[PDB]
Design a protein around this ligand. Structure first.
Ligand SMILES: [Zn+2]
Ligand SMILES: [Zn+2]
Lengths: 235, 93
C-alpha cells in the first residue's frame, strides 16, 4: 500500500492554484489510514484524481472539474459524480449498484454491470444506451439526445426521459410506477401503457401523439371504470 | 434525515431539500437552480414545470398565476438576482 501515499504526494504537487489538492490529499490519507468505506472529494475544484483507495464502497466526487476518472476500485457500490465535465466513464466495477453522473458531457456509457439498480445520467450528451441490466430499478436520462431506448428490465419502477428525441417507446413492464416522457417525438404509445397499476403515473405531454392515439386515450382514461394509470397528455 | 434528489440522486436532509407544491418530488437545491435558471434564460415559462415529474399541467390558465405565486418564494431564495428579476420580467410578459 506503499505506492498510494506518494502517488498522492506527487499528485498534490502537479496541479493548478485553483485546485484544493491539499484538502483532497488529507481526505484521501485519512480515508486510507482508517480503511474507511466512503471517500468524499466533493467541491474541491479538482481537475484530475489520482489512483483511488482500493477498499471504498462509496465515491462522492460531485462538483469538480474532472473530464475523466481513474480506474474505479473493484468494490464500489455507489458513485456520486454529478456536476463535472466527464466526457466518458471507465469500466464499471461489477459491484456497482448506483451511478450518478448527472450534469456532465458523456457521449456514450460503458457496459452496465449486472447489479446496477440506479442509473442517473441527466444532462449529458448520450445518443444511445447500452442494454439495460436486469436489476435496474431507476433510469434517469432526461435532457440528452437519445434517438431510441433499449428494452426495459422487469423491475424498473422509475423512468425519466424528458427532452430527448425518442420516436418509439418499448413495451412497459408492470414494475413501472412513474414514467416521465415529455418533449420527445412519440407519435403512439405501446398498449402495455394501459396495463400499469392504478397508482402509476405517466406523462407524455409535449409529444406529437397522433389523433387516433389521443382519441383512444381520452376514450379510455375517462371511461367509467378506468383502472389504469393517470396519463397526462396535452392537446 | 436524508432524502434523495429526484433528478440527480443526491441525498440531503429534507430540511435542506426543495419541494414543489402541486407535485411530490424532492429536488436538490442545485438541480432546482440550474433547471429553472436554464428554463428562464433559454426556454419559455411554460417549460418551467417540475424537472422530476413534468407537472402541473400548464397551458391551462386557471393554474398559471397560482403556480408562479407559490413557486416565487423559493425562486427568490434560490436564484441568483439577475435570474430572479428576469423571472419577474418574463412573467408580466
Ligand atoms: Zn439534484
Ligand atoms: Zn414533481
Amino acid at each position: 500500500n506503499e505506492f498510494y501515499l506518494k502517488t498522492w504526494s506527487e499528485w498534490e504537487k502537479n496541479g493548478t492554484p485553483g485546485e484544493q489538492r491539499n484538502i483532497a490529499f488529507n481526505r484521501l490519507k485519512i480515508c486510507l489510514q482508517n480503511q474507511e468505506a466512503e471517500l468524499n472529494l466533493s467541491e474541491l475544484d479538482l481537475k484530475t484524481l489520482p489512483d483511488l483507495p482500493p477498499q471504498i464502497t462509496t465515491l462522492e466526487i460531485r462538483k469538480n472539474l474532472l473530464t475523466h476518472l481513474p480506474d474505479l476500485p473493484p468494490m464500489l457500490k455507489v458513485i456520486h459524480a454529478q456536476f463535472n465535465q466527464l466526457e466518458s466513464l471507465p469500466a464499471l466495477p461489477e459491484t456497482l449498484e448506483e451511478l450518478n453522473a448527472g450534469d456532465n458531457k458523456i457521449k456514450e456509457l460503458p457496459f452496465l454491470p449486472e447489479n446496477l439498480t440506479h442509473l442517473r445520467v441527466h444532462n449529458n450528451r448520450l445518443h444511445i444506451l447500452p442494454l439495460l441490466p436486469p436489476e435496474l430499478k431507476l433510469l434517469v436520462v432526461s435532457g440528452n439526445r437519445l434517438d431510441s431506448i433499449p428494452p426495459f428490465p422487469d423491475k424498473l419502477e422509475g423512468l425519466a426521459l424528458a427532452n430527448n428525441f425518442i420516436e418509439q417507446l418499448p413495451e412497459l413492464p408492470f414494475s413501472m410506477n412513474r414514467a416521465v416522457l415529455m418533449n420527445n417525438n412519440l407519435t403512439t404509445l405501446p398498449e402495455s401503457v394501459l396495463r400499469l397499476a392504478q397508482n402509476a403515473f405517466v406523462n407524455v405531454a409535449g409529444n406529437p401523439l397522433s389523433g387516433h392515439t389521443m382519441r383512444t386515450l381520452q376514450q379510455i382514461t375517462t371511461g367509467p371504470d378506468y383502472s389504469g394509470p393517470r396519463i397526462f397528455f396535452s392537446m | 434525515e436524508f432524502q434523495e434528489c429526484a433528478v440527480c440522486g443526491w441525498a440531503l436532509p429534507h430540511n435542506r431539500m426543495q419541494a414543489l407544491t402541486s407535485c411530490e418530488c424532492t429536488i436538490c437545491p442545485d438541480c432546482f437552480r440550474q433547471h429553472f435558471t436554464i428554463a428562464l434564460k433559454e426556454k419559455h415559462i411554460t417549460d418551467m414545470v417540475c424537472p422530476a415529474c413534468g407537472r402541473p399541467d400548464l397551458t391551462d390558465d386557471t393554474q398559471l398565476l397560482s403556480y408562479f405565486s407559490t413557486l416565487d418564494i423559493q425562486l427568490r431564495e434560490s436564484l441568483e438576482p439577475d435570474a430572479y428579476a428576469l423571472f419577474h420580467k418574463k412573467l408580466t410578459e
